[PDB]
Design an enzyme around this catalytic site. Structure first.
Site, PDB file in Angstrom:
ATOM      1  N   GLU A 228      43.033  29.213  37.373  1.00  0.00           N
ATOM      2  CA  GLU A 228      42.538  29.445  35.925  1.00  0.00           C
ATOM      3  C   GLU A 228      41.828  28.193  35.545  1.00  0.00           C
ATOM      4  O   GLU A 228      40.964  28.407  34.616  1.00  0.00           O
ATOM      5  CB  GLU A 228      43.824  30.039  35.266  1.00  0.00           C
ATOM      6  N   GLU A 266      34.618  35.246  39.787  1.00  0.00           N
ATOM      7  CA  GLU A 266      35.877  35.300  40.587  1.00  0.00           C
ATOM      8  C   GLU A 266      35.419  34.631  41.901  1.00  0.00           C
ATOM      9  O   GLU A 266      36.330  34.170  42.702  1.00  0.00           O
ATOM     10  CB  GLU A 266      36.288  36.782  40.767  1.00  0.00           C
TER      11      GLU A 266
HETATM   12 ZN   LIG Z   1      40.156  34.464  38.347  1.00  0.00          ZN
END
Ligand SMILES: [Zn+2]
Length: 424
Positions: A228, A266
């Site tokens: 994160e 991502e």
């Molecule tokens: Zn992520």
């Protein structure tokens, strides 16, 4: 000054410096009417911990078992988690311990220093960089705003799924145009989702010839938070665009999800084997887009600054520039170097290697595995220096992350994924 991690107990008194009652950044949205303010703790300069459930967006507003089948197969629901002072203090100690672990290695300390100092580019008012709610949180007492304090990151507890972790940027234009935006992270240090990885050092039946097989492991929550924190860095530099997908069948970027695809944000944030074959065309387009966005901001905004203040000094440390007041230009070579570090070097897989943490091979997991509870505040189970892989206990080489380890406790859930209890 060496990076300082502030310690706190949940019952520490309000001081207006590091302990405040915070008005939610999303207080203006109709779904958040009447929420807060919430006790908040400044763990690192411009980094705040709020021991509250994240429920400030459309997808997190309802903490109850969902009214639709939208639920994910490994989610755990409990609208009462984090509603007592003891659970809030446990959460606060857990986030502080995970940050102490991240700061224990130079790569983690530099990541925390980067998030602390990399403020979003402020708007200009009367020739000066001037703060907005995109770079601050409000200390609210009763129905009065006492003050606004700088904030680049606010860490909360989990949303509806108590074992899920997410990041939300506050303003959608600044997150992708080079300005940057404040980030809110929903984090769960005690409820973890296991993953599969091939391994051969575990108790095995004597009749099994080849013991090297897929085994279940728990993640190190420091790796989960560092994941994160890499998204946070992208959000603060205004280089996050969640509308692009990487197509594994064609090696092309697309603006919609296809059969075998992954949001490009991502793919980069996780890193590992899947990011080693990105085309030079994609990399050059990403760099040119960021460079053009920064050139535009330096010309249209930074060159309008006529007031030298501390915010200008902070921005010159964030953005490599050359020239003088009113005539700055991007330092191309230094900008490219910092951008490539934030995009291609900083990722969960690279950081996990530096901490001797096991992470899965692919961001997308092949199957769901029920979440577990683990008391990471117990130094016998989890240490700031080694996480679960404690050498003095023979748990080095990732063995402490093996799911049959005694400190990973099973959670009994009903068919609807509702939390029943932790099995000690
Ligand atoms: Zn992520």
């Amino acid at each position: 000054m060496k990076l300082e991690i502030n310690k706190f107990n949940y019952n520490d008194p309000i001081d207006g410096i590091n302990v405040i009652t915070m008005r939610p950044p999303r207080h203006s949205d109709k779904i958040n009417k009447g929420k807060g303010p919430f006790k908040a703790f400044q763990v690192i300069k411009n980094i705040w911990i709020v021991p509250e459930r994240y429920n400030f967006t459309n997808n997190t507003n309802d903490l109850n078992i969902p009214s639709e089948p939208i639920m994910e197969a490994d989610a755990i629901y409990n609208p009462n988690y984090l509603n007592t002072p003891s659970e809030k203090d446990e959460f606060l100690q857990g986030v502080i311990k995970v940050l102490e672990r991240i700061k224990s290695k130079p790569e983690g300390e530099k990541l925390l220093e980067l998030i602390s100092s990399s403020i979003p580019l402020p708007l200009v008012s009367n020739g000066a960089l001037t703060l907005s709610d995109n770079e601050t949180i409000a200390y609210q007492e009763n129905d009065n705003i006492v003050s606004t304090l700088q904030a680049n990151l606010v860490i909360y507890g989990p949303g509806p799924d108590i074992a899920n972790n997410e990041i939300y940027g506050l303003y959608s234009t600044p997150i992708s145009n080079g300005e940057g935006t404040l980030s809110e992270v929903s984090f769960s240090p005690f409820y973890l989702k296991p993953f599969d990885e091939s391994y051969g050092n575990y108790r095995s039946l004597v009749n099994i010839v080849n013991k090297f097989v897929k085994r279940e492991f728990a993640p190190d929550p420091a790796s989960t938070l560092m994941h994160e924190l890499v998204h946070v860095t992208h959000n603060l530099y205004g280089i996050s665009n969640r509308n692009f997908y990487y197509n594994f069948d064609t090696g092309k970027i697309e603006t919609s999800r296809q059969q075998n695809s992954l949001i490009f944000e991502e793919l980069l944030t996780f890193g590992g084997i899947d990011s080693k074959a990105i085309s030079s065309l994609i990399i050059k387009k990403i760099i040119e887009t960021a460079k053009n966005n920064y050139t535009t901001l330096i010309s249209e905004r930074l060159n309008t600054v006529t007031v030298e203040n501390d915010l200008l000094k902070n921005i010159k440390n964030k953005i490599p520039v050359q020239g003088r007041l009113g005539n700055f230009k991007l330092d191309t070579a230094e900008f490219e170097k910092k951008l490539n570090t934030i995009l291609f070097v900083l990722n969960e897989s690279n950081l996990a290697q530096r901490f001797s943490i096991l992470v899965r091979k692919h961001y997308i997991k092949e199957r769901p595995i029920d979440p577990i509870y683990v008391n990471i505040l117990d130094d016998n189970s989890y240490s700031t220096l080694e996480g679960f892989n404690i050498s003095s206990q023979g748990s080095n080489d990732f063995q402490g992350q093996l799911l049959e380890s005694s400190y990973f406790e099973k959670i009994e859930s009903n068919a609807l994924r509702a939390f029943i209890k932790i099995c000690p």
